[PDB]
Amino acid sequence: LFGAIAGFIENGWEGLIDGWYGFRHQNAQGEGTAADYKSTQSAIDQITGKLNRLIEKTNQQFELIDNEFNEVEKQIGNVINWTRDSITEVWSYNAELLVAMENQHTIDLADSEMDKLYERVKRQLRENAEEDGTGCFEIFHKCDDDCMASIRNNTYDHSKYREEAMQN
């Protein structure tokens, strides 16, 4: 676990319905809550990949070994049931473990994709900003809906904005 989702970030945005991970800035010109695609998509293609691994096709046929209209001899009958029940315990165990393990990883995986989004927005706004501590970045040079777009789509100049913010 990476410490973002249910981490220092207190909660989620039940109005963000455009993707899994997004942006929301608080400047002068009103507002804007957005969506990041390449973080949303990458986490989606991985959950989708897990799911498509659990759907498969045994070309493995099994036949009747028992008879429910006409019970087989008791001794062989009991061996068969004993065998079937043993096998049932095995699969019930495998299933329970598989899902628990997979869910644990899925959860740690989505948390990962938050932290990987963040930590590279952080590296985009080099010294022209600071980490608030709730997933927020205080920009010390009043960015706008042209700047804010340049961050969202990774084009923000990590220098041609600097010293205006540096001495503040």
């Binding site: 899994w20 659990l54 209209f69 299933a95 628990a100 869910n103 920009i139």
Partner: protein
């Protein structure tokens, strides 16, 4: 600038390695509970035996007259089915069923046996056709007259085919020693059977059994698989139901037992008594004895798989 993640009002609890009931944004079921209460048989050569018992297809009681040479990918046994007109049963009956279930059906072939100096048309009111009849593939061999005697005969049949020949005969057990003689004459009667593979022998055992189909006698059915070019030999002297025809396996099939009806509108590969399991899920909680190509049976009703992040509302 700040960034967060999405969330929802009502989420789905799942279980993890560390927790039980942690809410995630979305989940999906992993265990199949949905049954279709019909035998999905779309595209498959199917045979519903109804009242004909599977073993009856070999011996030929009237229920099985239209099944003496069936051909199938899928064989359906029914509870109302009977292998028998005249009361009796097969030795190692279940092994035979499993053979017949994966046989693809049967082809019949005359074994050629000719008889001289005995009767041949033994029948009963337990096997009704016109009036009294018998198993269609079998021969109720008898002493010539209403007593008389039975010449210890020998019949032999050679499998001249490239496949094993299913041979089946019967031992008749009469109500009494009185009846056994009135049919086959007196004395301890003996049937011996051997192939370059097989080795057995039989004496009848007369006595009064309770009435089944209005009859107190029984017929013991036995069988063996004759390999190609191997020969089988029947040394007998009475109490004997002769094989008239042999049976050959056609190829491959799957056999099931069910109480629900056929549907050529749905395709299935996983069957059980109450219908068809059509699913992509790796597991099922419907029937542990389901056959064909099935998800693995598990005891759990439900196991939810996370398809999203942890759901955290404000």
């Amino acid at each position: 600038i700040c960034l967060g993640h999405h969330a929802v009002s009502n989420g789905t609890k799942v279980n993890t390695l560390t927790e039980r009931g942690v809410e995630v944004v979305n989940a999906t079921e992993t265990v199949e509970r949905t049954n279709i209460p019909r035998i999905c048989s779309k595209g498959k050569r199917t045979v519903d035996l109804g009242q004909c018992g599977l073993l009856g297809t070999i011996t030929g009681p009237p229920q099985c007259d239209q099944f003496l040479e069936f051909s199938a990918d899928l064989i359906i046994e029914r509870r109302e089915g009977s292998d028998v007109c005249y009361p009796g049963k097969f030795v190692n009956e279940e092994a035979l069923r499993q053979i017949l279930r994966e046989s693809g059906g049967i082809d019949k072939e005359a074994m050629g046996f000719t008889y001289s100096g005995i009767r041949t048309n033994g029948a009963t009111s337990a096997c009704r056709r016109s009036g009294s009849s018998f198993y269609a593939e079998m021969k109720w061999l008898l002493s010539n007259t209403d007593n008389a005697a039975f010449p210890q005969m020998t019949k032999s049949y050679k499998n001249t085919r490239k496949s094993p020949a299913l041979i089946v005969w019967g031992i008749h057990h009469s109500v009494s020693t009185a009846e056994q003689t009135k049919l086959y004459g007196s004395g301890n009667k003996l049937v011996t059977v051997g192939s370059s593979n097989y080795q057995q022998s039989f004496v009848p055992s007369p006595g009064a059994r309770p009435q089944v189909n209005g009859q107190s006698g029984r017929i013991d059915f036995h069988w063996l698989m004759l390999n190609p070019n191997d020969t089988v030999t029947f040394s007998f002297n009475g109490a004997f139901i002769a094989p008239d025809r042999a049976s050959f396996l056609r190829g491959k099939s799957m056999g099931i037992q069910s109480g629900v009806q056929v549907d050529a509108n749905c395709e299935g590969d996983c069957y059980h008594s109450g219908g068809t399991i059509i699913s992509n899920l790796p597991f099922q909680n419907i029937d542990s004895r389901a056959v064909g190509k099935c998800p693995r049976y598990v005891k759990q009703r439900s196991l939810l798989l996370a398809t999203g992040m942890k759901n955290v509302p404000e």
